[PDB]
């Protein structure tokens, strides 16, 4: 998958601010915060090793809220990310994972997909006029100490109160408009390299809310690679809304609760998970993607004109050419292919995968996103004799190489803090 | 945002 790293450079967390990979920068909408040291670690790319108050200025507050309101799958450590030791080893712990997705076949087509997924440019009120969406950069300070605007496709953050928070609470962007329209936004993710979840190996075990304790533990390469696939889906504006859902009626413990799971969540999964999507909305979702791209080709076709840039309207059409794989005429005319489109959406959609993930990584991971979490343990990944690119948890030429030893939590009991149970308080 | 239930 990589021969040249995706991460070029060992970043630490106290290297001088140099005004372009590791600079001090501000997020759009969010004016006033306190600019954040932040790291550039690859095109398109950064990571901001801060817990998430700036995002959503709903979640500014770190402290556990009263112990009567806290859920069972919950976790609260105000303090956790907050140390300068802290932050250099969650970029090195986020930048092995990504090298690690990297390494395999199907993380070198995801990132490249990532990569080139260049939020649209149809920020005009003008439809003839190609103008860049604001939201979709970050304000980067120089150093001369002004701002430059810099478009990126892709941050990673910490977590915000909420540490092992499972779904979102509010909102994402609330253009999420943008991500369901083929346009594409800047996706954030909130993730830690120092947290993973125990699961347990029996399908009728992990699948029970009463049952297990977590005695595998997930590895947060798949966790990363799951956040990333939803934001490939949100970067070429194809995200299904959240309010499309499966009343999940195949498992007896979600349905006497009502329990519902968005069809995102089962795409993203994959494997028998996504066949739990009425096959006629599916057709539905995708004949809707397929005119948003084609209003995305007329768009292209119409502009007569691009601002906020020195970039030529053609150098700029033909990046949305290829981020869209769109055909083009002999009168330059862009047009949709169904053969292409059908291609680029079956890539995000069915390809890329956790249920692929797992088979290229060769971890042992829940079977369904329909289960129940066990447990919640603090990891270290970062020394090479904890965590490896190529092997994740199970280091070759050790006792751990085998059986998926380095993920059993009894075995590699070294390798696993753990610090809440999560079963049997659910609700039942 | 994510991981679910
Ligand atoms: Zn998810």
């Given at each position: 998958?990589?021969?040249?790293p995706f991460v070029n450079?060992?970043?630490?967390?106290?290297?001088?601010?140099?005004?372009?990979?590791?600079?001090?920068?501000?997020?759009?909408?969010?004016g006033?915060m306190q600019?954040?040291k932040?790291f550039?670690?690859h095109?398109?790319?950064?990571?901001?090793?801060?817990?998430?108050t700036?995002?959503n200025?709903?979640?500014?507050?770190?402290?556990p809220?009263?112990?009567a309101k806290?859920?069972?799958?919950?976790?609260y450590?105000?303090?956790?990310?907050?140390?300068?030791?802290?932050?250099?080893?969650?970029?090195?712990?986020?930048?092995?994972?990504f090298?690690?997705?990297?390494?395999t076949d199907?993380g070198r087509?995801?990132?490249?997909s990532?990569?080139?997924?260049?939020?649209?440019?149809?920020?005009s009120?003008?439809?003839?006029?190609?103008?860049?969406?604001?939201?979709?950069?970050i304000?980067?300070?120089?150093?001369?100490?002004?701002?430059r605007?810099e478009?990126?496709?892709?941050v990673i953050?910490?977590?915000?109160?909420?540490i092992?928070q499972?779904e979102?609470?509010?909102?994402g962007?609330?253009?999420?408009?943008?991500?369901?329209?083929?346009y594409?936004?800047?996706?954030?993710?909130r993730?830690?390299?120092?947290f993973?979840?125990?699961?347990?190996e029996?399908?009728?075990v992990?699948?029970?809310?009463?049952?297990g304790?977590?005695?595998?533990?997930?590895?947060?390469?798949?966790?990363?690679?799951h956040?990333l696939?939803?934001?490939?889906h949100?970067?070429?504006?194809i995200?299904?809304?959240?309010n499309?859902?499966f009343?999940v009626?195949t498992?007896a413990?979600?349905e006497?609760?009502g329990?519902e799971?968005?069809?995102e969540?089962?795409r993203?999964?994959?494997?028998?998970?996504?066949?739990f999507?009425?096959?006629?909305?599916?057709?539905?979702?995708?004949?809707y993607?397929?005119?948003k791209?084609?209003?995305?080709?007329?768009?292209?076709?119409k502009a007569?004109?691009i601002?906020?840039?020195?970039a030529?309207?053609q150098?700029?059409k033909?990046?949305?050419?290829?981020?869209?794989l769109?055909?083009?005429?002999?009168?330059?005319?862009?047009?949709v292919?169904?053969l292409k489109?059908?291609?680029?959406?079956?890539?995000?959609?069915?390809?890329?995968?956790?249920?692929n993930?797992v088979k290229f990584?060769?971890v042992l991971?829940?079977?369904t996103?329909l289960?129940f979490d066990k447990?919640?343990?603090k990891?270290?990944?970062?020394?090479?004799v904890?965590?490896?690119?190529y092997?994740?948890?199970?280091?070759?030429?050790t006792?751990?190489?085998?059986?998926?030893?380095?993920?059993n939590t009894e075995?590699?009991?070294?390798?696993f803090?753990?610090?809440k149970?999560?079963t049997?308080?659910f609700?039942? | 945002?994510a991981?679910?239930?």
């Amino acid at each position: 998958g990589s021969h040249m790293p995706f991460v070029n450079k060992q970043f630490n967390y106290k290297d001088p601010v140099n005004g372009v990979d590791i600079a001090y920068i501000k997020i759009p909408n969010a004016g006033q915060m306190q600019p954040v040291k932040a790291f550039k670690i690859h095109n398109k790319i950064w990571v901001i090793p801060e817990r998430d108050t700036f995002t959503n200025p709903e979640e500014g507050d770190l402290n556990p809220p009263p112990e009567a309101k806290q859920v069972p799958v919950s976790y609260y450590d105000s303090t956790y990310l907050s140390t300068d030791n802290e932050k250099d080893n969650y970029l090195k712990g986020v930048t092995k994972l990504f090298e690690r997705i990297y390494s395999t076949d199907l993380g070198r087509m995801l990132l490249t997909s990532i990569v080139r997924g260049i939020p649209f440019w149809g920020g005009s009120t003008i439809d003839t006029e190609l103008k860049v969406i604001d939201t979709n950069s970050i304000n980067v300070i120089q150093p001369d100490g002004s701002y430059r605007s810099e478009e990126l496709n892709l941050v990673i953050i910490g977590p915000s109160a909420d540490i092992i928070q499972f779904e979102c609470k509010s909102f994402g962007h609330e253009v999420l408009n943008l991500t369901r329209n083929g346009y594409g936004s800047t996706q954030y993710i909130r993730f830690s390299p120092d947290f993973t979840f125990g699961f347990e190996e029996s399908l009728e075990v992990d699948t029970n809310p009463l049952l297990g304790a977590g005695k595998f533990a997930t590895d947060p390469a798949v966790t990363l690679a799951h956040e990333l696939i939803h934001a490939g889906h949100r970067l070429y504006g194809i995200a299904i809304n959240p309010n499309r859902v499966f009343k999940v009626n195949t498992n007896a413990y979600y349905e006497m609760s009502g329990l519902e799971v968005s069809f995102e969540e089962l795409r993203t999964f994959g494997g028998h998970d996504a066949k739990f999507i009425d096959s006629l909305q599916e057709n539905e979702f995708r004949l809707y993607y397929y005119n948003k791209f084609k209003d995305i080709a007329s768009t292209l076709n119409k502009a007569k004109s691009i601002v906020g840039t020195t970039a030529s309207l053609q150098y700029m059409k033909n990046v949305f050419k290829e981020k869209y794989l769109l055909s083009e005429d002999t009168s330059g005319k862009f047009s949709v292919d169904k053969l292409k489109f059908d291609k680029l959406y079956k890539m995000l959609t069915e390809i890329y995968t956790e249920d692929n993930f797992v088979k290229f990584f060769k971890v042992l991971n829940r079977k369904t996103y329909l289960n129940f979490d066990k447990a919640v343990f603090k990891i270290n990944i970062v020394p090479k004799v904890n965590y490896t690119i190529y092997d994740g948890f199970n280091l070759r030429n050790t006792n751990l190489a085998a059986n998926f030893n380095g993920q059993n939590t009894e075995i590699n009991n070294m390798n696993f803090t753990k610090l809440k149970n999560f079963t049997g308080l659910f609700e039942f | 945002x994510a991981x679910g239930x």
